[PDB]
Amino acid sequence: MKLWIDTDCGIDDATAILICLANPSIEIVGISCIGGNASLQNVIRNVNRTLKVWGKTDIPIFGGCQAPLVQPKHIHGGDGLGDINDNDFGTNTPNKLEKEHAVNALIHAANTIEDLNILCLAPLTNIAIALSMAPEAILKIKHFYIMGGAEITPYGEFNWRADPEAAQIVLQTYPQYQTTIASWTLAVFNSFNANDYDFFNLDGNLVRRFIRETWKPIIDGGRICPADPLAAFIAVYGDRAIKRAERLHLSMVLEGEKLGMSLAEPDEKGCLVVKECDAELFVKILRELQD
């Protein structure tokens, strides 16, 4: 599976990225960066940290837009990655960043790489702009896997509320039938008690140290809500990752008091909205990658 990743690399992004790095059947052809959890510069820094920790700097990193499309301007720390110390990980080395804008690089990849899939872990600003400039190219992409949206209070949702116009563009331009959704609701339904589960609190190697220290601030009232990892889990392990799912046509509320929330109607040509995951397989995947 050839996979592009769009990220606002904060903490759960980095672990999502590791889930893709760990599967040998996955080929990451590019990572685009967008502001969100942290500034665009911090996101590029943090993608670099994540790749350097895993030991595969083989993947081109593209910088995207710095702000949401229309809406004006944290939890993942000051640096967006749990305020970790580069000297404790050996990641105080120059960062790689390609010259092409993330929008142009994604268009070129969609135009030239066959059977390209995309994993969207962030507000959809880069994607929406790409769809605006070359919809024919982006429409060549085989499948969209998106973390975002909510049905558990919806006010925990970040990606689509952060740029509801970009989400609307995606949802009305790229075919929803070829779209799978890992929602914020799903991240809370499949959440774990960190007083009962230890898979984000190991040591022995660089990977475990990285996961343990990055997740510490996010672990919320001591719960692990693994939104972006679940999205990567679904993208990489397909139907085996999914227990329950429903087909829903989705749209953004772009005005009024519910601005940024989403509307969903049962529709068989709509998004595949995952409603429950295989948590046992999920944890096993998380543990295996930390070997």
Q: Provide, rounded to whole angstroms, the least separation between the CB of residue 224 and a second copy.
A: 9
**Is 225 a binder of a second copy (CB under 8 A)?**
yes
Instruction: Return the HEC string of the chain.
Output: CEEEEEECCCHHHHHHHHHHHHCCCCEEEEEEECCCCCCHHHHHHHHHHHHHHHCCCCCCEEECCCCCCCCCCCCCCCCCCCCCCHHHCCCCCCCCCCCCCHHHHHHHHHHHCCCEEEEECCCCHHHHHHHHHCHHHHCCCCEEEEECCCCCCHHHCCHHHHCHHHHHHHHHHCCHHHEEEECHHHHHHCCEECCCCCCCCCCCCHHHHHHHHHHHHHCCCCEECCHHHHHHHHHHHHHHHEEEEEEEEEEECCCCCCCCCEEEEECCCCEEEEEEECHHHHHHHHHHHCC
| Residue 139 or 159 with smaller CB distance to Ca ion | 159
Pick between residue 121 and residue 167 the one whose CB is nearest to Ca ion: 121
Position 213 contacts Ca ion (CB under 5 A): no
Ranges within 272-291 binding a second copy (CB under 8 A): none
8 is known as an active-site residue: yes
State which of residues 27, 83, 203, 288 lies at the interface with a second copy (CB under 8 A). 83
| Shortest Å distance, C-beta 63 to Ca ion | 16
121, interface contact from Ca ion, a second copy, none, CB < 5-8 Å by kind: Ca ion
Nearer to Ca ion, 67 or 94 (CB): 67
Q: How far is the CB of 62 from a second copy (least distance, A)?
A: 12
Residue positions annotated with a catalytic role: 8
Residues forming the site for a second copy (CB under 8 A): 64-67, 69-70, 72, 74-78, 82-83, 101, 103-104, 125, 129, 132-135, 152-156, 158, 165, 168-169, 172, 184, 188, 191, 193-195, 217, 219-223, 225, 254-256, 259
